[PDB]
């Protein structure tokens, strides 16, 4: 298809890219520039494909792939050919997030789904998927990004509209509800934690209300502070958000194609930048 593309995310090397669409496949198109190169078209799905993510590399590059049908297909190259080495299909509804744990943490894919569920996929000793079922939002969990070190941590984005911070403890064995946020009034699209290389994380918690509410932690022990990217309803509705590995620069594309390089300046103003 490749014309109502809904994801294209790279690995940490930036040399491998996986683009999905309404194609019902994962057409692997790795980065050689603005030329990319097919290696295999992975058919296994039925219906529209939403998110893929390669593994963070310390446990291979391993492509998850979540989709309408219920299915997250663990694909892996094993001797220069592919093989779906596990299936993680514990959902019925649209699966909406797959995001690996960063290789500052161990093997912990994060699956989220609008059936109500987050699933913390535990890789067993043959790579055998086994999740612990958790709930964040009980309308549906539309997204799930990880919180790396700027123990284990992540964030999920509401269809209840809340953006719940989830923090791991080992005397109760699951993600303790750390806090709960809300400046949102229609459903969350994408919750993007910043990978800053220092104590600071902003979270452009992208919303359908035609607004994106940037929660800010000036330093991590500073609290979540409500600010807006701009202080008006946008004309159109807002899509995928990212934050850089070094600089903490926001990047989002709008419906009218709002290019966003608006980083928080001295004065506290989301200020246009290079």
């Amino acid at each position: 298809h490749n014309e109502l593309i809904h994801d294209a995310v790279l690995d940490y090397y930036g040399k491998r890219l996986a683009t999905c669409s309404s194609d019902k496949t994962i057409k692997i198109f790795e980065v050689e520039g603005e030329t990319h190169k097919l290696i295999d078209t992975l058919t296994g799905h039925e219906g529209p494909v939403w998110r893929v993510d390669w593994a963070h590399p310390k446990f291979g590059t391993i492509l998850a792939s979540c989709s309408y049908d219920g299915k997250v297909l663990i694909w892996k190259e094993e001797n220069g050919r592919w093989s779906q080495i596990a299936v993680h299909a514990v959902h019925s509804a649209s699966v909406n997030s797959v995001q690996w744990a960063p290789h500052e943490y161990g093997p912990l894919l994060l699956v989220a789904s609008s059936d109500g569920k987050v699933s913390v996929v535990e890789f067993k000793e043959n790579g055998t998927t086994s999740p612990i079922i958790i709930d964040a939002h009980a309308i549906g969990v539309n997204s799930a990004s990880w919180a790396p070190a700027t123990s284990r941590k992540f964030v999920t984005g509401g269809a209840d509209n809340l953006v719940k911070i989830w923090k791991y403890n080992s005397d109760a064995q699951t993600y303790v509800l750390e806090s709960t946020l809300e400046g949102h009034s229609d459903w969350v699209r994408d919750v993007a934690w910043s990978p800053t290389v220092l104590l600071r994380s902003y979270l452009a918690s992208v919303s359908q209300d035609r607004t994106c509410i940037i929660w800010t932690q000036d330093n991590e022990q500073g609290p979540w502070k409500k600010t807006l990217l701009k202080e008006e309803k946008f004309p159109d509705v807002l899509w995928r958000a990212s934050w850089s590995l070094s600089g903490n620069v926001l990047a989002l594309s709008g419906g009218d194609n709002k290019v966003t390089l608006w980083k928080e300046n001295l004065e506290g103003k989301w200020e246009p930048a290079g």
Partner: peptide, 13 residues
Amino acid sequence: ERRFTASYTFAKF
């Protein structure tokens, strides 16, 4: 259920 309006773009790093 994604709540997307159909006309998707994105910007990534």
